[PDB]
């Protein structure tokens, strides 16, 4: 009956179509309706109890086609529906929700690494561009806290980034925040107890296990306990006050590992694994 963690898409041998739901109360997994088009490097989010899958790329034996798609999944009917596509394809997109609107941040289309950002209004089924980031970012992690949206890390097409910036929707303005301690592309970014977390990622050479968090009051990033496994392109979400990380690539393997961070004890637990290893998933909870 409780909230489930949804994982959509991803990569193992080619881009994937899986939608599976995880119940952290017992570690069980439920396979649901496949996405209509495989994609890796997508994002997931939830608005009004509906799951959305946004952007990515279909890496298949035929091509490497970037996605502009937005698809909506209804857990009560187990059906995927197409929504309006974005202005441009966005592989390695970041997504956050403010007041019921979905913001699509950065990502790539062919050789283009975007700084542009657009927002979707579910009640009108429309996307419109808003102000661009100060930095081109793909592989960027996004989280929203008290109606400010953070874009953390990523890759600008030449440099992996430690920098981060914040969007102020009432001013349609982006402003740089303090940079992270570590360069991270493909990290998992989320918010928990008024801190923005960046877990794992890739610094240009190594997949990382380290985790740091940005305290909005102090404006400082501080390391917390490292995950049990190094990973980039991991899914991440918060469920019942704990962070969950799912899958990723560790420089050797496609992980099926899921771990759960308890912020009181500052510890990571190995919980029940994915049904198969994969990286570049979209995740959300409801």
């Amino acid at each position: 009956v409780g909230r489930l963690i949804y994982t959509a898409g991803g990569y193992f041998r080619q881009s994937l179509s899986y939608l599976e739901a995880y119940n952290p109360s017992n570690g069980s997994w439920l396979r649901l309706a496949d996405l209509q088009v495989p994609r890796s490097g997508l994002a997931g989010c939830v608005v009004g109890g509906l799951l959305y899958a946004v952007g990515g790329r279909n890496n298949s034996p035929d091509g490497n086609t970037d996605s502009s798609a937005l698809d909506c999944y209804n857990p009560m009917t187990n059906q995927w529906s197409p929504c309006a596509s974005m202005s441009v394809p966005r592989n390695r997109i970041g997504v956050g929700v403010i007041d019921g609107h979905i913001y699509a941040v950065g990502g790539s289309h062919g050789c283009i690494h975007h700084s542009s950002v657009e927002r979707y209004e579910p009640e009108r089924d429309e996307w419109h561009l808003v102000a661009p980031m100060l930095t081109r970012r793909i592989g960027v992690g996004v989280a929203v806290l008290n109606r400010l949206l953070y874009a953390v890390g990523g890759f600008d097409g030449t440099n992996r980034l430690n920098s981060a910036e914040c969007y102020y929707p009432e001013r349609n303005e982006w402003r740089m925040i303090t940079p992270m301690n570590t360069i991270r592309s493909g990290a998992g970014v989320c918010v928990l107890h008024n801190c923005i977390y960046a877990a794992g990622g890739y610094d240009g050479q190594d997949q990382l296990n380290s985790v740091e968090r940005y305290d909005v009051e102090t404006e400082t990033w501080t390391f917390v306990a490292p995950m049990r496994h190094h990973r980039s392109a991991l899914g991440i979400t918060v469920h019942q006050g704990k962070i969950y990380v799912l899958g990723g690539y560790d420089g050797h393997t496609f992980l099926d590992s899921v771990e759960c961070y308890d912020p009181d004890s500052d510890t990571w637990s190995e919980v029940t694994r994915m049904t198969s290893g994969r990286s570049g998933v979209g995740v959300a909870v409801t």
Binding site: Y11, S40, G41, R57, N59, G63, N64, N91, R92, S108, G110, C111, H113, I138, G139, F155, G157, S185, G186, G201, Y202, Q207, S232, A233, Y249, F254, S279, G280
Partner: peptide, 24 residues
């Protein structure tokens, strides 16, 4: 610095192989 290298570097941290981006 060619287009295969640029596309692959967008997914290198998923663990995707460069070979996946090269079609003859």
């Amino acid at each position: 610095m060619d287009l295969i290298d640029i596309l692959w570097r967008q997914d290198i941290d998923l663990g995707v192989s460069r070979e996946v981006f090269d079609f003859s």
